[PDB]
Design a protein around this ligand. Structure first.
Ligand SMILES: CC(C)(COP(=O)(O)OP(=O)(O)OC[C@H]1O[C@@H](n2cnc3c(N)ncnc32)[C@H](O)[C@@H]1OP(=O)(O)O)[C@@H](O)C(=O)NCCC(=O)NCCS
Ligand SMILES: CC(C)(COP(=O)(O)OP(=O)(O)OC[C@H]1O[C@@H](n2cnc3c(N)ncnc32)[C@H](O)[C@@H]1OP(=O)(O)O)[C@@H](O)C(=O)NCCC(=O)NCCS
Ligand SMILES: O=C(N[C@H](CO)[C@H](O)c1ccc([N+](=O)[O-])cc1)C(Cl)Cl
Length: 267
Protein backbone atom coordinates (compact mmCIF):
# COMPACT_ATOMS: atom_id res chain seq x y z
CA UNK A 1 0.00 0.00 0.00
CA UNK A 2 2.89 2.36 0.89
CA UNK A 3 4.92 0.89 -2.01
CA UNK A 4 2.19 1.05 -4.65
CA UNK A 5 2.49 3.91 -7.12
CA UNK A 6 0.62 5.02 -10.25
CA UNK A 7 2.34 7.41 -12.65
CA UNK A 8 0.31 8.88 -15.52
CA UNK A 9 2.83 9.44 -18.31
CA UNK A 10 2.34 11.28 -21.63
CA UNK A 11 5.04 9.17 -23.31
CA UNK A 12 7.23 6.30 -22.11
CA UNK A 13 10.91 7.10 -21.71
CA UNK A 14 13.47 4.38 -22.31
CA UNK A 15 13.43 2.69 -18.88
CA UNK A 16 9.63 2.66 -18.57
CA UNK A 17 9.64 0.95 -21.98
CA UNK A 18 12.05 -1.78 -20.82
CA UNK A 19 9.92 -2.50 -17.73
CA UNK A 20 6.78 -2.86 -19.89
CA UNK A 21 8.52 -5.53 -21.99
CA UNK A 22 9.39 -7.44 -18.81
CA UNK A 23 5.70 -7.29 -17.83
CA UNK A 24 4.66 -8.27 -21.38
CA UNK A 25 6.90 -11.34 -21.42
CA UNK A 26 5.48 -12.38 -18.05
CA UNK A 27 1.89 -11.92 -19.25
CA UNK A 28 2.81 -13.58 -22.57
CA UNK A 29 4.10 -16.65 -20.76
CA UNK A 30 1.11 -16.89 -18.44
CA UNK A 31 -1.71 -16.08 -20.92
CA UNK A 32 -0.38 -17.33 -24.27
CA UNK A 33 -1.22 -14.04 -26.00
CA UNK A 34 -0.91 -10.36 -25.11
CA UNK A 35 -2.99 -7.25 -25.85
CA UNK A 36 -1.84 -4.78 -28.51
CA UNK A 37 0.66 -2.43 -26.88
CA UNK A 38 1.91 -0.44 -29.91
CA UNK A 39 5.49 0.02 -28.72
CA UNK A 40 6.61 2.33 -31.54
CA UNK A 41 3.60 4.46 -30.58
CA UNK A 42 4.42 4.43 -26.86
CA UNK A 43 7.55 6.49 -27.56
CA UNK A 44 5.82 9.59 -28.99
CA UNK A 45 4.45 12.61 -27.14
CA UNK A 46 0.66 13.01 -27.23
CA UNK A 47 -1.78 15.74 -26.24
CA UNK A 48 -3.07 14.11 -23.03
CA UNK A 49 -1.31 11.79 -20.54
CA UNK A 50 -1.93 8.44 -22.06
CA UNK A 51 -0.02 5.48 -20.52
CA UNK A 52 -0.65 4.53 -16.88
CA UNK A 53 2.00 2.63 -14.93
CA UNK A 54 1.33 0.72 -11.71
CA UNK A 55 4.42 -0.01 -9.61
CA UNK A 56 4.72 -2.06 -6.43
CA UNK A 57 7.96 -1.34 -4.57
CA UNK A 58 9.44 0.22 -7.74
CA UNK A 59 8.52 -2.80 -9.86
CA UNK A 60 6.06 -2.42 -12.75
CA UNK A 61 3.11 -4.77 -12.20
CA UNK A 62 0.34 -3.11 -14.20
CA UNK A 63 -0.07 -1.02 -17.33
CA UNK A 64 -3.03 0.64 -19.05
CA UNK A 65 -2.81 2.66 -22.24
CA UNK A 66 -5.28 4.43 -24.49
CA UNK A 67 -4.87 4.79 -28.23
CA UNK A 68 -6.28 7.35 -30.66
CA UNK A 69 -6.77 5.88 -34.12
CA UNK A 70 -13.42 4.98 -30.99
CA UNK A 71 -10.59 4.23 -28.48
CA UNK A 72 -8.47 1.14 -27.90
CA UNK A 73 -7.63 0.29 -24.26
CA UNK A 74 -4.76 -2.12 -23.49
CA UNK A 75 -4.57 -3.38 -19.88
CA UNK A 76 -1.90 -5.72 -18.50
CA UNK A 77 -1.45 -6.85 -14.88
CA UNK A 78 1.27 -9.13 -13.56
CA UNK A 79 -0.26 -12.59 -12.84
CA UNK A 80 0.97 -12.42 -9.21
CA UNK A 81 -1.18 -9.35 -8.53
CA UNK A 82 -4.42 -10.12 -10.42
CA UNK A 83 -7.91 -9.74 -8.84
CA UNK A 84 -6.55 -7.19 -6.34
CA UNK A 85 -8.04 -4.01 -7.81
CA UNK A 86 -5.10 -3.12 -10.09
CA UNK A 87 -6.94 -2.87 -13.43
CA UNK A 88 -9.82 -1.19 -11.58
CA UNK A 89 -7.52 1.50 -10.24
CA UNK A 90 -5.91 1.84 -13.68
CA UNK A 91 -9.05 2.59 -15.73
CA UNK A 92 -10.16 5.19 -13.17
CA UNK A 93 -6.92 7.03 -13.85
CA UNK A 94 -8.27 7.10 -17.42
CA UNK A 95 -12.02 7.31 -16.81
CA UNK A 96 -12.09 11.15 -16.18
CA UNK A 97 -10.44 12.19 -19.43
CA UNK A 98 -13.80 1.70 -25.24
CA UNK A 99 -12.28 -1.12 -27.37
CA UNK A 100 -10.27 -3.58 -25.25
CA UNK A 101 -7.79 -5.94 -26.93
CA UNK A 102 -7.89 -9.23 -25.07
CA UNK A 103 -5.83 -12.45 -25.20
CA UNK A 104 -8.05 -14.97 -26.92
CA UNK A 105 -10.12 -17.22 -24.58
CA UNK A 106 -8.95 -15.58 -21.34
CA UNK A 107 -11.91 -13.39 -20.39
CA UNK A 108 -14.86 -14.57 -22.47
CA UNK A 109 -17.32 -15.56 -19.72
CA UNK A 110 -16.93 -12.52 -17.51
CA UNK A 111 -16.70 -9.85 -20.24
CA UNK A 112 -20.23 -10.73 -21.40
CA UNK A 113 -21.67 -10.81 -17.86
CA UNK A 114 -20.62 -7.16 -17.49
CA UNK A 115 -22.03 -6.19 -20.84
CA UNK A 116 -19.02 -6.12 -23.11
CA UNK A 117 -19.72 -6.80 -26.79
CA UNK A 118 -17.49 -8.91 -29.05
CA UNK A 119 -16.33 -7.12 -32.23
CA UNK A 120 -13.87 -9.47 -33.96
CA UNK A 121 -10.58 -11.27 -33.40
CA UNK A 122 -7.07 -10.79 -34.80
CA UNK A 123 -4.42 -13.49 -35.23
CA UNK A 124 -0.70 -13.36 -35.93
CA UNK A 125 0.19 -16.68 -37.48
CA UNK A 126 3.57 -18.20 -38.27
CA UNK A 127 4.64 -20.94 -40.65
CA UNK A 128 8.16 -22.19 -39.85
CA UNK A 129 8.20 -25.37 -41.96
CA UNK A 130 10.90 -25.00 -44.64
CA UNK A 131 9.13 -27.44 -47.02
CA UNK A 132 7.08 -25.92 -49.86
CA UNK A 133 3.41 -26.74 -50.45
CA UNK A 134 2.71 -29.20 -53.22
CA UNK A 135 -3.19 -27.08 -58.24
CA UNK A 136 -6.12 -24.79 -59.16
CA UNK A 137 -6.90 -23.09 -62.52
CA UNK A 138 -5.14 -19.92 -61.35
CA UNK A 139 -2.19 -17.95 -62.61
CA UNK A 140 -0.35 -15.33 -60.58
CA UNK A 141 1.37 -12.05 -61.34
CA UNK A 142 2.91 -9.21 -59.35
CA UNK A 143 0.80 -6.05 -59.29
CA UNK A 144 2.09 -2.79 -60.80
CA UNK A 145 0.71 0.76 -60.69
CA UNK A 146 -1.44 -0.13 -63.71
CA UNK A 147 -3.30 -2.59 -61.44
CA UNK A 148 -4.76 0.15 -59.22
CA UNK A 149 -8.36 -0.32 -60.54
CA UNK A 150 -8.16 -4.11 -60.01
CA UNK A 151 -6.73 -3.68 -56.49
CA UNK A 152 -9.33 -1.08 -55.50
CA UNK A 153 -12.16 -3.25 -56.85
CA UNK A 154 -10.96 -6.28 -54.86
CA UNK A 155 -10.59 -4.27 -51.65
CA UNK A 156 -14.05 -2.73 -52.15
CA UNK A 157 -15.89 -6.06 -52.03
CA UNK A 158 -13.66 -7.90 -49.55
CA UNK A 159 -13.00 -5.15 -47.01
CA UNK A 160 -16.06 -2.86 -47.40
CA UNK A 161 -8.49 6.38 -49.83
CA UNK A 162 -7.80 3.11 -51.66
CA UNK A 163 -6.12 4.56 -54.77
CA UNK A 164 -3.38 6.31 -52.81
CA UNK A 165 -3.01 3.59 -50.18
CA UNK A 166 -2.25 1.10 -53.00
CA UNK A 167 -0.04 3.71 -54.66
CA UNK A 168 1.90 3.94 -51.41
CA UNK A 169 2.14 0.17 -50.95
CA UNK A 170 3.22 -0.47 -54.54
CA UNK A 171 5.92 2.23 -54.42
CA UNK A 172 7.38 0.88 -51.15
CA UNK A 173 10.20 -1.55 -51.97
CA UNK A 174 9.56 -3.84 -48.99
CA UNK A 175 5.98 -4.44 -50.23
CA UNK A 176 4.62 -6.40 -53.17
CA UNK A 177 1.12 -7.51 -54.10
CA UNK A 178 0.32 -10.81 -55.84
CA UNK A 179 -2.79 -10.91 -58.05
CA UNK A 180 -4.59 -14.21 -58.65
CA UNK A 181 -6.13 -14.62 -62.12
CA UNK A 182 -8.94 -17.01 -63.02
CA UNK A 183 -8.41 -17.25 -66.77
CA UNK A 184 -8.28 -13.55 -67.69
CA UNK A 185 -10.20 -12.38 -64.58
CA UNK A 186 -8.47 -11.15 -61.42
CA UNK A 187 -10.16 -12.86 -58.52
CA UNK A 188 -7.82 -12.14 -55.71
CA UNK A 189 -4.82 -10.64 -54.12
CA UNK A 190 -2.30 -10.97 -51.32
CA UNK A 191 0.17 -8.43 -49.96
CA UNK A 192 3.70 -9.45 -49.02
CA UNK A 193 5.95 -7.39 -46.79
CA UNK A 194 9.47 -8.69 -47.22
CA UNK A 195 12.17 -8.75 -44.57
CA UNK A 196 15.63 -10.38 -44.60
CA UNK A 197 14.63 -13.58 -42.74
CA UNK A 198 10.86 -13.62 -43.22
CA UNK A 199 7.91 -12.14 -45.04
CA UNK A 200 4.41 -11.33 -43.90
CA UNK A 201 1.22 -11.98 -45.87
CA UNK A 202 -1.72 -9.62 -45.32
CA UNK A 203 -4.90 -8.23 -46.88
CA UNK A 204 -5.70 -11.50 -48.61
CA UNK A 205 -8.86 -11.17 -50.66
CA UNK A 206 -10.86 -13.48 -52.92
CA UNK A 207 -13.94 -12.20 -54.74
CA UNK A 208 -17.06 -13.37 -52.82
CA UNK A 209 -18.37 -15.22 -55.92
CA UNK A 210 -15.09 -17.16 -56.26
CA UNK A 211 -14.80 -18.21 -52.61
CA UNK A 212 -15.19 -21.82 -51.55
CA UNK A 213 -13.29 -23.11 -54.60
CA UNK A 214 -9.82 -23.40 -53.08
CA UNK A 215 -8.55 -20.17 -54.67
CA UNK A 216 -7.65 -18.64 -51.28
CA UNK A 217 -5.55 -21.67 -50.29
CA UNK A 218 -3.95 -21.77 -53.75
CA UNK A 219 -3.09 -18.06 -53.46
CA UNK A 220 -1.54 -18.37 -49.99
CA UNK A 221 0.28 -21.60 -50.95
CA UNK A 222 1.73 -19.71 -53.95
CA UNK A 223 2.90 -16.89 -51.70
CA UNK A 224 4.45 -19.30 -49.18
CA UNK A 225 6.39 -21.09 -51.92
CA UNK A 226 7.44 -17.78 -53.45
CA UNK A 227 8.74 -16.68 -50.06
CA UNK A 228 10.64 -19.97 -49.50
CA UNK A 229 12.25 -19.78 -52.93
CA UNK A 230 13.89 -16.54 -51.76
CA UNK A 231 15.50 -18.20 -48.75
CA UNK A 232 13.27 -16.90 -45.98
CA UNK A 233 12.77 -19.29 -43.09
CA UNK A 234 9.38 -18.03 -42.02
CA UNK A 235 6.03 -16.90 -43.36
CA UNK A 236 3.90 -14.76 -41.06
CA UNK A 237 0.28 -13.91 -41.56
CA UNK A 238 -2.12 -11.44 -40.01
CA UNK A 239 -5.82 -12.12 -40.45
CA UNK A 240 -8.89 -10.62 -38.79
CA UNK A 241 -11.99 -12.76 -38.42
CA UNK A 242 -15.30 -12.86 -36.64
CA UNK A 243 -15.24 -16.63 -36.12
CA UNK A 244 -12.57 -19.20 -35.27
CA UNK A 245 -13.85 -21.52 -38.02
CA UNK A 246 -12.10 -19.19 -40.50
CA UNK A 247 -8.57 -20.19 -39.33
CA UNK A 248 -8.76 -23.79 -40.55
CA UNK A 249 -7.82 -22.40 -43.96
CA UNK A 250 -4.45 -21.32 -42.56
CA UNK A 251 -4.02 -24.30 -40.16
CA UNK A 252 -4.17 -26.55 -43.25
CA UNK A 253 -1.27 -24.67 -44.89
CA UNK A 254 0.96 -25.12 -41.80
CA UNK A 255 0.34 -21.85 -39.96
CA UNK A 256 0.32 -21.85 -36.16
CA UNK A 257 -1.15 -19.19 -33.90
CA UNK A 258 1.56 -17.10 -32.27
CA UNK A 259 -0.78 -14.47 -30.83
CA UNK A 260 -4.56 -14.10 -30.77
CA UNK A 261 -6.69 -11.16 -29.58
CA UNK A 262 -10.43 -10.61 -29.22
CA UNK A 263 -11.64 -6.99 -29.45
CA UNK A 264 -14.41 -6.32 -26.94
CA UNK A 265 -16.47 -3.12 -26.43
CA UNK A 266 -18.07 -0.93 -23.78
CA UNK A 267 -19.27 2.55 -22.42
C1 LIG B 1 -7.83 -8.71 -17.46
C2 LIG B 1 -6.80 -8.11 -16.39
C3 LIG B 1 -6.21 -6.81 -16.95
C4 LIG B 1 -7.57 -7.78 -15.07
O1 LIG B 1 -6.62 -7.33 -14.14
P1 LIG B 1 -7.04 -7.46 -12.58
O2 LIG B 1 -6.26 -6.48 -11.73
O3 LIG B 1 -6.78 -8.91 -12.16
O4 LIG B 1 -8.64 -7.05 -12.48
P2 LIG B 1 -9.23 -6.14 -11.23
O5 LIG B 1 -8.72 -6.83 -9.97
O6 LIG B 1 -8.83 -4.66 -11.30
O7 LIG B 1 -10.87 -6.17 -11.33
C5 LIG B 1 -11.49 -7.34 -10.86
C6 LIG B 1 -12.92 -7.31 -11.29
O8 LIG B 1 -13.03 -7.17 -12.83
C7 LIG B 1 -13.56 -8.63 -13.30
N1 LIG B 1 -12.38 -9.44 -13.49
C8 LIG B 1 -11.09 -9.27 -13.67
N2 LIG B 1 -10.53 -10.48 -13.80
C9 LIG B 1 -11.47 -11.39 -13.71
C10 LIG B 1 -11.39 -12.77 -13.78
N3 LIG B 1 -10.35 -13.78 -13.96
N4 LIG B 1 -12.49 -13.52 -13.66
C11 LIG B 1 -13.67 -12.92 -13.48
N5 LIG B 1 -13.75 -11.56 -13.41
C12 LIG B 1 -12.65 -10.77 -13.52
C13 LIG B 1 -14.36 -8.90 -12.26
O9 LIG B 1 -15.52 -8.01 -12.26
C14 LIG B 1 -13.47 -8.54 -10.96
O10 LIG B 1 -14.27 -8.44 -9.80
P3 LIG B 1 -13.60 -8.46 -8.28
O11 LIG B 1 -13.59 -7.08 -7.77
O12 LIG B 1 -14.45 -9.34 -7.36
O13 LIG B 1 -12.20 -9.02 -8.31
C15 LIG B 1 -5.73 -9.14 -16.02
O14 LIG B 1 -6.37 -10.35 -15.77
C16 LIG B 1 -4.72 -9.26 -17.19
O15 LIG B 1 -3.78 -8.59 -17.26
N6 LIG B 1 -4.99 -10.28 -18.24
C17 LIG B 1 -4.06 -10.38 -19.40
C18 LIG B 1 -4.41 -9.21 -20.34
C19 LIG B 1 -5.94 -9.04 -20.66
O16 LIG B 1 -6.73 -9.96 -20.60
N7 LIG B 1 -6.39 -7.73 -21.09
C20 LIG B 1 -7.78 -7.44 -21.44
C21 LIG B 1 -8.17 -6.21 -20.55
S1 LIG B 1 -9.99 -6.17 -20.17
C1 LIG C 1 -11.11 -15.43 -46.41
C2 LIG C 1 -10.87 -15.71 -47.95
C3 LIG C 1 -9.55 -15.09 -48.44
C4 LIG C 1 -10.81 -17.26 -48.18
O1 LIG C 1 -10.83 -17.43 -49.57
P1 LIG C 1 -11.39 -18.81 -50.21
O2 LIG C 1 -11.00 -18.90 -51.68
O3 LIG C 1 -12.91 -18.88 -50.03
O4 LIG C 1 -10.64 -20.02 -49.38
P2 LIG C 1 -10.61 -21.59 -49.84
O5 LIG C 1 -11.71 -21.89 -50.84
O6 LIG C 1 -9.25 -21.88 -50.46
O7 LIG C 1 -10.78 -22.55 -48.49
C5 LIG C 1 -11.99 -22.63 -47.75
C6 LIG C 1 -12.12 -23.98 -47.05
O8 LIG C 1 -11.97 -25.16 -48.04
C7 LIG C 1 -10.70 -26.03 -47.56
N1 LIG C 1 -9.87 -26.29 -48.68
C8 LIG C 1 -9.18 -25.69 -49.62
N2 LIG C 1 -8.61 -26.65 -50.36
C9 LIG C 1 -8.96 -27.83 -49.86
C10 LIG C 1 -8.65 -29.11 -50.24
N3 LIG C 1 -7.87 -29.75 -51.28
N4 LIG C 1 -9.14 -30.18 -49.56
C11 LIG C 1 -9.93 -29.97 -48.50
N5 LIG C 1 -10.24 -28.70 -48.11
C12 LIG C 1 -9.75 -27.62 -48.80
C13 LIG C 1 -10.06 -25.24 -46.67
O9 LIG C 1 -9.46 -26.01 -45.60
C14 LIG C 1 -11.15 -24.18 -46.07
O10 LIG C 1 -11.73 -24.58 -44.83
P3 LIG C 1 -12.53 -26.02 -44.56
O11 LIG C 1 -11.48 -27.09 -44.30
O12 LIG C 1 -13.40 -25.91 -43.34
O13 LIG C 1 -13.37 -26.45 -45.70
C15 LIG C 1 -12.06 -15.12 -48.70
O14 LIG C 1 -13.18 -15.51 -48.00
C16 LIG C 1 -12.05 -13.56 -48.76
O15 LIG C 1 -11.51 -12.99 -49.61
N6 LIG C 1 -12.77 -12.78 -47.70
C17 LIG C 1 -12.76 -11.28 -47.74
C18 LIG C 1 -11.43 -10.75 -47.20
C19 LIG C 1 -10.90 -11.56 -45.96
O16 LIG C 1 -11.67 -12.15 -45.23
N7 LIG C 1 -9.48 -11.60 -45.69
C20 LIG C 1 -8.89 -12.32 -44.55
C21 LIG C 1 -7.35 -12.50 -44.82
S1 LIG C 1 -6.31 -11.00 -44.44
O1 LIG D 1 -3.96 -4.43 -34.68
C1 LIG D 1 -3.66 -4.34 -35.83
N1 LIG D 1 -2.27 -4.44 -36.28
C2 LIG D 1 -1.03 -4.65 -35.50
C3 LIG D 1 -0.23 -5.70 -36.28
O2 LIG D 1 0.10 -5.23 -37.56
C4 LIG D 1 -1.21 -5.08 -34.02
O3 LIG D 1 -2.23 -4.33 -33.43
C5 LIG D 1 -0.01 -4.83 -33.10
C6 LIG D 1 -0.17 -3.91 -32.09
C7 LIG D 1 0.84 -3.63 -31.20
C8 LIG D 1 2.04 -4.29 -31.30
N2 LIG D 1 3.10 -3.96 -30.33
O4 LIG D 1 2.82 -3.53 -29.27
O5 LIG D 1 4.47 -4.13 -30.63
C9 LIG D 1 2.21 -5.23 -32.29
C10 LIG D 1 1.20 -5.51 -33.19
C11 LIG D 1 -4.77 -4.10 -36.85
CL1 LIG D 1 -4.35 -4.76 -38.46
CL2 LIG D 1 -6.35 -4.69 -36.26
Amino acid sequence: PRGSMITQVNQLDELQLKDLKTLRAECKKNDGSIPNLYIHILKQHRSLPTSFLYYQNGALIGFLSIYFFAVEVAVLVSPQYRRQGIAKQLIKEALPLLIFSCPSRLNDNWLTSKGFTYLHSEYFMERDDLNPILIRPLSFRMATLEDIPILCGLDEVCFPDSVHRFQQILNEREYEIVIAMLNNHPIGKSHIRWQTKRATLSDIAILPKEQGKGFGSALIAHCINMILSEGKSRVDLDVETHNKKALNLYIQLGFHIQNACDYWSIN
